[PDB]
């Protein structure tokens, strides 16, 4: 079991209400801290209105919602692939430089994203020497520092 956390650089000042039109980094299409929890959360405080109905387009309603994302694994929406590092043909594959926990966070570190949707051990695991350079978006419209994820997380995820 992990916690889903939303990780941001210190010195940006956007809160959870303020996410529309930001850029984002996800581990990949369909993963738990990655597409599932933040996108469903955003859908249920009504930030992402489900744009589709020729077609349940979740990918569309999300592309409508952030400016540009990296979401390795994305099928339909070429906005979702727009911040991804790598080659033309490769960069948005389900494994690619920006795929996964480590890659979602490297997206944000690299400046390629304003937020990374990840898990509670990602910043320590990947950059223990730069943890104070980050904080976490809480659901209550505050920030807390990276250690505070028990008190600052989008959800607790099963095994
Ligand atoms: Fe996961």
Swiss-Prot record:
Family of this protein: Belongs to the transferrin family.
Coiled-coil region(s): none
Function (record text): Transferrins are iron binding transport proteins which can bind two Fe(3+) ions in association with the binding of an anion, usually bicarbonate. It is responsible for the transport of iron from sites of absorption and heme degradation to those of storage and utilization. Serum transferrin may also have a further role in stimulating cell proliferation.
Species in which this protein is naturally found: Anas platyrhynchos (Mallard)
Cellular component annotations (GO), alphabetically ordered: early endosome; extracellular space; plasma membrane; recycling endosome
Location(s) in or outside the cell: Secreted
Keywords, sorted A to Z: Disulfide bond, Glycoprotein, Ion transport, Iron, Iron transport, Metal-binding, Repeat, Secreted, Transport
Single Gene Ontology MF annotation: metal ion binding
SUBUNIT field: Monomer.
Disulfide bonds: 25-107, 70-84, 81-92, 138-152
GO biological-process terms attached to the record: antibacterial humoral response; iron ion transport
Keyword Repeat: yes
Stated name of the protein: Ovotransferrin
């Amino acid at each position: 079991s992990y916690y889903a956390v939303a990780v941001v650089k210190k010195g940006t000042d956007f809160m959870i209400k303020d996410l529309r039109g930001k850029t984002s980094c996800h581990t990949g299409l369909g993963r738990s801290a990655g597409w599932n929890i933040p996108i469903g959360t955003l859908i249920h405080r009504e930030d992402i209105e489900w744009e589709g109905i020729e077609s349940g387009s979740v990918e569309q309603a999300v592309a409508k919602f952030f400016s540009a994302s990296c979401v390795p694994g994305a099928t339909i929406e070429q906005k979702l692939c727009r911040q991804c590092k790598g080659d033309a043909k490769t960069k948005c594959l389900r494994n690619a430089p920006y795929s996964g926990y480590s890659g979602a966070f490297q997206c944000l570190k690299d400046g390629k994203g304003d937020v990374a949707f990840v898990k509670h051990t990602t910043v320590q695991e990947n950059a223990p020497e730069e943890k104070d350079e980050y904080e976490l978006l809480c659901l209550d419209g505050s920030r807390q520092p990276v250690d505070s994820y028990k008190t600052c997380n989008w959800a607790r995820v099963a095994a």
